[PDB]
Design a binder for this molecule. Sequence first.
Ligand SMILES: NC(=O)c1ccc[n+]([C@@H]2O[C@H](COP(=O)([O-])OP(=O)(O)OC[C@H]3O[C@@H](n4cnc5c(N)ncnc54)[C@H](O)[C@@H]3O)[C@@H](O)[C@H]2O)c1
Ligand SMILES: NC(=O)c1ccc[n+]([C@@H]2O[C@H](COP(=O)([O-])OP(=O)(O)OC[C@H]3O[C@@H](n4cnc5c(N)ncnc54)[C@H](O)[C@@H]3O)[C@@H](O)[C@H]2O)c1
Ligand SMILES: NC(=O)c1ccc[n+]([C@@H]2O[C@H](COP(=O)([O-])OP(=O)(O)OC[C@H]3O[C@@H](n4cnc5c(N)ncnc54)[C@H](O)[C@@H]3O)[C@@H](O)[C@H]2O)c1
Ligand SMILES: NC(=O)c1ccc[n+]([C@@H]2O[C@H](COP(=O)([O-])OP(=O)(O)OC[C@H]3O[C@@H](n4cnc5c(N)ncnc54)[C@H](O)[C@@H]3O)[C@@H](O)[C@H]2O)c1
Lengths: 318, 318
Amino acid sequence: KVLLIGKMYDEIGEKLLAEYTNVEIIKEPKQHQIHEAIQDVSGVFVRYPTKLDAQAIGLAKNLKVISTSGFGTDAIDIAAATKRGIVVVNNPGLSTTAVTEHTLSMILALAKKLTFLNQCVKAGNYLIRNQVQPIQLEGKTLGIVGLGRIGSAVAKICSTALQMRVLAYDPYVPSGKADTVRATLVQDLDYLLTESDFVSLHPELTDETCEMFDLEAFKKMKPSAFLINTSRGKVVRQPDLVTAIREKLIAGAAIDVFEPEPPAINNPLYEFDNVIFSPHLAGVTPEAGMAAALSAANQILQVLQGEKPPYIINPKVW
Amino acid sequence: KVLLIGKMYDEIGEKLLAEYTNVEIIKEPKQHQIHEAIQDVSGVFVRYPTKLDAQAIGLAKNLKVISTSGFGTDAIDIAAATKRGIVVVNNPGLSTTAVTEHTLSMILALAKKLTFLNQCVKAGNYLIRNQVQPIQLEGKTLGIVGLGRIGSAVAKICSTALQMRVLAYDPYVPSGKADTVRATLVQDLDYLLTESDFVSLHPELTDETCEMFDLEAFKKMKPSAFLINTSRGKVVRQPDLVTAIREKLIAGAAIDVFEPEPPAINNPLYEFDNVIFSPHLAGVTPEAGMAAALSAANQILQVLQGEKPPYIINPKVW
Ligand SMILES: NC(=O)c1ccc[n+]([C@@H]2O[C@H](COP(=O)([O-])OP(=O)(O)OC[C@H]3O[C@@H](n4cnc5c(N)ncnc54)[C@H](O)[C@@H]3O)[C@@H](O)[C@H]2O)c1
Ligand SMILES: NC(=O)c1ccc[n+]([C@@H]2O[C@H](COP(=O)([O-])OP(=O)(O)OC[C@H]3O[C@@H](n4cnc5c(N)ncnc54)[C@H](O)[C@@H]3O)[C@@H](O)[C@H]2O)c1
Ligand SMILES: NC(=O)c1ccc[n+]([C@@H]2O[C@H](COP(=O)([O-])OP(=O)(O)OC[C@H]3O[C@@H](n4cnc5c(N)ncnc54)[C@H](O)[C@@H]3O)[C@@H](O)[C@H]2O)c1
Ligand SMILES: NC(=O)c1ccc[n+]([C@@H]2O[C@H](COP(=O)([O-])OP(=O)(O)OC[C@H]3O[C@@H](n4cnc5c(N)ncnc54)[C@H](O)[C@@H]3O)[C@@H](O)[C@H]2O)c1
């Protein structure tokens, strides 16, 4: 009595759901296919970015729970569920460890000039060791923008294990949270820009953070400093980032998120040896996919058994 | 009087020697320049790889201490110094943090397939994200070969911060050292090979460890496992490593040390996308150079004051 609008990130969530419910799978949804199989179901799983409009909720009679595939909920008609007594739940933060490790990977890679030194050896220029010198992270200053799930885990590892001085900028967290991860929360963003040897951004994308890192920000940063962005592409005004690299306002950057996405085949950032990329894979591990599949599949069984799930979007229904 | 055959890695070691001794510096030393300036000095610092033969030792009348720039001592005639009552000291272990960070850099890089994913994006193959999936380190098993200065620091960070199960193989270490870094010391090496998802080498190069990682070792390793070598090139028999990669006995490797060194323009390892390189820079940071310069400069002053230095190579002179 459950419909899967799109496949889950891991098959374990499908096997678990088949233990307790009659499961139906729609693989590539169109405007008409969804409804003719949604009219009688009691639970629905929506894969981002597939959309679920008011026409779909109106036809699902026994529907009691809507679950997204991840944090994204913009494609779902929340209003149609709050009035009808339907609880809607998302699955956020289940790739926190993945991006935390991925962020660390890019900080170390920039410090050890990894991708550059790899090509030099691969092209027989092993003697580049006489001209290039890596950087030791122990003792350097890390600037964390956004002390959320990822920012805290990154801060915790860099301050204690890597023995870095971690500054944090996040006005929406209690003043005592930065001390729990041995970081120092600051109130002025300019202070974090001038003092950091590395700047890694993990904030939510808001109207405030949209293009928060423009040319005005890059000027304040040390010329030897580096930028890491695993959050969202729009957080950095990319032309100003191209300017900072070319005019050497910063020593380099590591980029997992782009604007626009996907980045064009001839992105000007590709030319620089001090900029490295990953194709938006920071939170894409097999383990993270299982967690999203489990959390989404399991919260379905919670509502069908009367238990309050942890990630309700409309609390006015409980 | 103290002679510097070559500059120290940092000027701080030279300033310290000038505080207490009459210091002379030869920047690009020749064999005959050494002879004409060593006759009256009482301490000498030799920058690798310059050689100090019996002819130079024989001409140094007031000589009481010889200090190398690092761990390397093969260019010094120890026998000719041991006979004349001259103490020889090296400078090992002064880049422990550097190699620890560099080792971590390569473990993360392999897990996130960094250089491969970097080239794909830079060449317009951004859609490689649909075919390749990174690895999450949390929960995987790290096999540390050699639980010394570097092996312990790598173990401590990987066990607690990165949340890995850390195994260690080292028959010459007390059983309780692995517990101080939240690792598990094992007595059978085969156990570490079969259980590890990552194997990182940090042993001393002895006749026991010489080519310790041959084809028999690679067969026991998981096909999904990776190899990291920042210790010495002879610890891995390079042909067997080339075979293991090509026959897919292991998932990849990271190499900072080679045998032979330097690697040629046509090293067979270069063809593979799952093998990454650094040109023997794991322990080469500005901080590491300062520490080595201090230790080398300090052991010179220690012998000139009658104090026993900690890194004597020929203890039979004391
Ligand atoms: N991929 C990365 O993560 C990363 C990060 C930082 C720097 N780099 C690269 O590493 C190199 C060193 O970093 P830096 O900040 O000290 O730059 P730098 O210009 O301040 O000093 C680098 C030295 O190495 C020499 N050199 C640099 N690039 C070379 C090349 N392609 N071929 C031959 N010789 C070269 C230069 O003559 C210079 O003296 C730069 O080319 C930079 O683009 C790469
Ligand atoms: N590259 C990937 O694969 C990937 C995966 C997951 C998440 N992300 C992104 O990484 C980022 C971090 O994720 P998260 O789980 O930590 O989110 P989160 O909700 O846990 O934390 C976001 C933080 O941003 C802070 N913040 C809000 N406005 C700010 C501002 N003006 N200045 C500074 N800080 C501000 C908030 O107080 C919050 O603590 C998000 O933007 C998310 O979309 C990327
Ligand atoms: N740190 C690194 O640089 C690193 C580490 C491991 C693997 N790799 C590379 O990543 C790729 C995938 O890793 P794997 O161990 O899972 O290999 P795999 O043989 O287990 O299969 C990988 C999957 O991705 C696809 N794929 C593999 N190589 C591809 C390529 N060059 N272009 C497009 N699609 C490809 C295949 O269709 C397959 O389904 C391999 O090419 C491997 O050499 C790089
Ligand atoms: N730039 C570089 O890449 C760089 C820098 C420094 C050192 N190194 C090399 O890496 C290693 C540095 O490690 P370290 O500083 O901790 O030295 P270390 O002496 O403190 O540790 C070496 C360990 O090897 C262990 N070992 C000896 N025989 C073994 C065996 N048969 N099996 C397993 N383990 C054995 C010893 O018990 C010892 O603990 C050395 O090989 C050194 O030459 C490389």
